[PDB]
Design a protein around this ligand. Structure first.
Ligand SMILES: CNCCCNc1c(N(C)S(=O)(=O)c2ccccc2)c(=O)[nH]c(=O)n1Cc1ccc(Br)cc1
Ligand SMILES: CNCCCNc1c(N(C)S(=O)(=O)c2ccccc2)c(=O)[nH]c(=O)n1Cc1ccc(Br)cc1
Ligand SMILES: CNCCCNc1c(N(C)S(=O)(=O)c2ccccc2)c(=O)[nH]c(=O)n1Cc1ccc(Br)cc1
Ligand SMILES: CNCCCNc1c(N(C)S(=O)(=O)c2ccccc2)c(=O)[nH]c(=O)n1Cc1ccc(Br)cc1
Ligand SMILES: [Cl-]
Ligand SMILES: [Cl-]
Ligand SMILES: [Cl-]
Ligand SMILES: [Cl-]
Ligand SMILES: [Cl-]
Ligand SMILES: [Cl-]
Ligand SMILES: [Cl-]
Ligand SMILES: [Cl-]
Lengths: 259, 278, 271, 261
């Protein structure tokens, strides 16, 4: 059992054709996570949008929020004794093998898993330094002189240790460094063939919109449609999808094989 | 040995410069299919184009020895079909395995090196890629049975059997030249159907996680440009930079990259010498 | 008579969305009523423009061609085109500039109809250091070529209207267009008209701006069902070519959206 | 002249750097209108109230009412009273040189109605206006199957004291035809040099966003910033702009210390 947390501290704005929250929600769903806590300021508006999630075969809970690590304190009782995963509300991911990348991370039963991605702008993120042999040797939160161009993405997989590490503090980078110092941090490369886009500024929200529109209008498939992912995980049956351009798309999913 | 062919066929936007010489954002369109053949490990490449455009590719790309490639050039007298590439490049292909790419196609995704590697390493039959599109009527369409086996190909069908379009990327064994010779426009789809009829066609799915973009219209060239710019300005890495791929294949050494970087894109090539990229 | 010069120092043969970049500055000179135009470019690019545009008689224009041996400055255009200009009023446009807005015919008309001094356009930009910057007291008091500390955010556009003085001013320079314009300013014969924020003046000179310019034109054109800076349209509306000539020009492009567009111009009133 | 914005949520979505409602709001403000009624759904009316307030921060008087497009004159009948009126739709964006003067001219007629005709690829989606050989408007059709022209009537309407009673007796096109039938409809051409964009679909909202970003990042000026328009109309002084300003804040500060023509 692994439980999910989305921290939305903007995430109700659409990226092209659906609310921004649908991307991190879809990401946790693709990783096989069904029990998800949405932490925000906005909490009632997410409740109004997403409900308890039983329409999508999910169990959605809500909590209200001083730092990203604070999510483990707020969701401590939600996490209980289970493995956890944390996603940030303003990140979207796209690529081939993304189901498998998440699967591998979510299936480790010990330590923590994070993803390093080559960016132009590493100073804006957690930066991970590698030695000559490609081993992760240091983490720095928004460094003035980055040790590498490899930014840690807003996607984190944690074992039962995280709550107690967070308690002894609030930077997510300190949590991740505590695992690294114990030799229990897995840093997987997210290859340049994957797209990890910021949706956090006026410019990047626009770029992300154009990016999704180009893929979707080319393929005739949607990126990060939660009802599709639910259906393909077999968390909802054809009857439930039937009940649930977006409506037309869901109908098409019942009458087409997509590989 | 597998040998590569890039077919760059043929207003008023393109009256001063053929389509595959137009830039997609920051580099000439030909750099994408060129980079694709290079990523598949192909170094000996024939560029077929119009009598007018062949000299301009020669002027842009040279013999390719700067990038550790062997580039040759041939002309297509008139646009009498895509299969005509095997007739024109028959002597270039000889008795070797071959690969055909179309000049106006752009590919991007994780495991693309591995997808190409697998196809290029088969020593028999033909390998093509099926991609889910909104607009299947514009392409070769591949129909699948309940067990996911390919059962038919149709060139630009009025009523497509599926949404799975065959991409502009083709891997062929020694049979292709003789199959092409016996065809009666000469369609690549007829070549592929001849393999399918012999049970020697491998149709690999190119997953929705890969981007296969058209660069063939004013609208799609613009979309493709915005797509590459977004990735490149996010990553600080280039898509389909031939000098990078050459360097990473170890077809050129750091000394050769330095020389190529000096006169120029140039700043980017210099950065490649002083950074580990996984 | 006012004679036009397009300096394209290749970039101006690249398309902005649906037509070659040169069609924008060409259309701009045409909208200003200029029919006799000299296209100055490199020895390599001059033949390619000749191949694209011809003598221009298809569009009721008289196009001539000259070469710039090496890129020794923008003012060099008046030395190269000295004989082409002769004793006539002149206009200079740069090959990588795109203009769009309401009253652009009237803005150009007014400038082209002055029979004395020089007329330039000041446009509020985020990035003034990249251009000639004009300082105001609303009277223009100074010009600086790509200043490190700009006196204002008002950039001088790539669009210049000159009287018979320009050739002799250019002859005595040591070669910046800004020095030419300052020589007029020093004589109190420089007219600096504001190009309002309601007009779009876009750079097409980098990978990023060429893309932005492309998206900009596509959005207008697909919204309106009208083209921006289509030379055959402007020629037809100036009555430099008749319906018969437009029909002939449309026929061979019949295949595509551009031929179809020219045919539509014969059977529709557009205000 | 009193203004009505009908926003029938979509008009709270941003076009690049500001809420969509800021464009039609800025349009009424540029036309010199300070008293504006925002009509929306029972659900969205409170959200506009929360965003915009009574508008006194921007030297405006903003009122709110809840909800065909002609129904706006019935709902805002008491708001309009005996005054001239102007109606804008919540999902339309306008840009061009002389837009202050185009609006000024329309807003300054003291009789009949003024609308704007714009050449579009897609006339069937709008009110279509037909012209005779002499450029006179001879007919209006609401979303015709066979459009008589490519000239769409924009979401921008100027009305005299007659409109409430015409509406009482529900398509905006019928209201406009009633004026046309009385020979009291002025149809001004909005030239191709102006941009009139739809922000009503996923595709057009994206296009509109890219369009505004390109202009704004080129000029270092904002399109349809209400605080700027208020300041330039002298409805608020430098002191009030300073308070409101305390990238968008930085922009308002810049407006106090720069001459912009
Ligand atoms: C062929 N396997 C790869 C799946 C394609 N991958 C899918 C993606 N991606 C393109 S993704 O993976 O990059 C992604 C997922 C969530 C958010 C953002 C991106 C998607 O958006 N939706 C979808 O249904 N699948 C198929 C799918 C989903 C779940 C199951 Br279970 C099975 C299929
Ligand atoms: C093995 N790392 C994953 C590959 C990343 N893949 C790379 C891509 N891609 C994003 S791609 O593969 O999608 C692609 C390649 C050619 C044309 C179009 C797309 C690219 O453009 N350039 C590059 O150098 N590589 C690394 C690379 C190249 C060659 C070698 Br050999 C090793 C690395
Ligand atoms: C009728 N006055 C409005 C002009 C609309 N203006 C036009 C523009 N503009 C949008 S523009 O003016 O901004 C412009 C012109 C050239 C290059 C770049 C922009 C245009 O591109 N094409 C066109 O035919 N006209 C009509 C037209 C042209 C010439 C004559 Br003569 C008559 C009509
Ligand atoms: C010559 N100046 C006319 C307007 C310039 N143009 C302005 C525009 N435009 C670009 S616009 O006019 O196309 C427009 C306005 C509102 C909504 C949509 C578009 C604008 O957005 N804001 C602004 O302050 N002005 C100056 C300004 C405004 C008010 C006064 Br009063 C004075 C100056
Ligand atoms: Cl981190
Ligand atoms: Cl990769
Ligand atoms: Cl095929
Ligand atoms: Cl995939
Ligand atoms: Cl100057
Ligand atoms: Cl203006
Ligand atoms: Cl109407
Ligand atoms: Cl106009």
């Amino acid at each position: 059992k692994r439980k999910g947390i989305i921290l939305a501290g903007k995430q109700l704005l659409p990226v092209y054709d659906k609310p921004m929250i649908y991307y991190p929600l879809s990401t946790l769903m693709l990783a096989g996570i069904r029990e998800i806590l949405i932490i925000s300021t906005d909490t009632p508006r997410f409740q109004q949008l997403l409900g308890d999630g039983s329409n999508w075969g999910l169990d959605l809970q809500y909590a209200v929020q001083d730092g990203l690590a604070q999510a483990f304190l707020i969701g401590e009782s939600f996490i209980g004794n289970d493995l956890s995963a944390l996603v940030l509300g303003d990140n979207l991911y796209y690529g081939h093998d993304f189901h498998e990348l998440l699967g591998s991370a979510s299936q480790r039963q010990t330590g923590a898993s994070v993803f390093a991605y080559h960016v132009l702008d590493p100073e804006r993120y957690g930066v991970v330094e590698f030695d000559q042999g490609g081993k992760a040797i240091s983490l720095e939160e928004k460094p003035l002189e980055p040790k590498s161009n490899y930014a840690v993405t807003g996607l984190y997989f944690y074992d039962q240790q995280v709550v107690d590490i967070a308690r002894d503090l609030l930077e997510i980078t300190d949590v991740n460094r505590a695992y690294l110092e114990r030799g229990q941090l897995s840093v997987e490369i997210m290859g340049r063939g994957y797209a990890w886009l910021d949706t956090g500024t006026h410019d990047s929200l626009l770029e992300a919109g154009q990016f999704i529109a180009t893929l979707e209008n080319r393929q005739g498939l949607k990126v990060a449609c939660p009802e599709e992912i639910a259906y393909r995980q077999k968390w909802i049956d054809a009857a439930q999808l039937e009940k649930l351009g977006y409506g037309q798309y869901l109908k098409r999913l019942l009458t087409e094989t997509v590989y």
